[PDB]
Swiss-Prot record:
Function of the molecule: Acts as a class I viral fusion protein. Under the current model, the protein has at least 3 conformational states: pre-fusion native state, pre-hairpin intermediate state, and post-fusion hairpin state. During fusion of viral and target intracellular membranes, the coiled coil regions (heptad repeats) assume a trimer-of-hairpins structure, positioning the fusion peptide in close proximity to the C-terminal region of the ectodomain. The formation of this structure appears to drive apposition and subsequent fusion of viral and target cell membranes.
Segment of the intact protein contained: 510 to 532 of 853
Name this polypeptide is given: Transmembrane protein gp41
Membrane topology field: Single-pass type I membrane protein
UniProt source species: Human immunodeficiency virus type 1 group M subtype B (isolate MFA)
Region ranges (Fusion peptide): 1-21
Compartmental location: Virion membrane; Host cell membrane; Host endosome membrane
Subunit structure: The mature envelope protein (Env) consists of a homotrimer of non-covalently associated gp120-gp41 heterodimers. The resulting complex protrudes from the virus surface as a spike. There seems to be as few as 10 spikes on the average virion.
Length: 24
């Protein structure tokens, strides 16, 4: 994870406030 993938894991995963995400 570097560019967009760092947002994907990172920016999006920080917004993983749903069970339907990496934080679930």
């Amino acid at each position: 994870a570097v560019g967009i993938g760092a947002l994907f894991l990172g920016f999006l995963g920080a917004a993983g406030s749903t069970v339907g995400a990496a934080s679930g």
